[PDB]
Design a protein around this nucleic acid. Sequence first.
DNA 1: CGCGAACGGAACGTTCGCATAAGTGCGC
Length: 194
Amino acid sequence: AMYHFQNKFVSKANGQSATAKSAFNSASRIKDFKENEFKDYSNKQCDYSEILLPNNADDKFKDREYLWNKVHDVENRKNSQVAREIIIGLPNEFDPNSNIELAKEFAESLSNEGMIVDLNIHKINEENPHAHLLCTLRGLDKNNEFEPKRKGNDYIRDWNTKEKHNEWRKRWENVQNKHLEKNGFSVRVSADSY
DNA sequence: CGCGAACGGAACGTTCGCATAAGTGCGC
Ligand SMILES: [Ca+2]
Ligand SMILES: [Ca+2]
Ligand SMILES: [Ca+2]
Ligand SMILES: [Ca+2]
Ligand SMILES: [Ca+2]
Ligand SMILES: [Ca+2]
Ligand SMILES: [Ca+2]
Ligand SMILES: [Ca+2]
Ligand SMILES: [Cl-]
Ligand code: NI
């Protein structure tokens, strides 16, 4: 019954971590190898967790611990951006089961592009059901290795452009409105303002 | 987006950070 779409970067230049975020959002304990710490946020809340892969991805990446360590490996810089976090507002009139399928579908539209998505749904059965989406900033190659982000000043993927940003905003509107109609609600949602 | 910082390899050529719209039923 409300629109909310946030697109942000997870950067090490601000003391952030992919292992910390994945643990904080999934309410699990994940080991960081390069720092030999244990990111233990298992005392947090999380009602649904899933990792969604693109077509040419190995089943290894469905493990949350391996994934973000493999990512940190490629992001071997002190200012390296490790991931992209997308949080979305879920309609609070939805039951958990239908709220999952809604968030699951939009996440699969991202893995079709094709990123790896760490989907975690927070506080269902509450006033503000939302879903965090940790997405990789690189794609996979023929050898299941991360491709580079950059070639000179140009990008390899179009994931970081305004056109793709505004596309994702409109996509979340359409997907959400579709599920709102399917479950039998007269309520719809919009992305723009003014 | 073009700039300089940050890589790998131990020069300086090359990959990167930077970050979009939108402000609630947010939240330290
Ligand atoms: Ca700061
Ligand atoms: Ca769970
Ligand atoms: Ca409620
Ligand atoms: Ca070095
Ligand atoms: Ca060598
Ligand atoms: Ca010399
Ligand atoms: Ca931009
Ligand atoms: Ca929120
Ligand atoms: Cl939070
Ligand atoms: Ni949350």
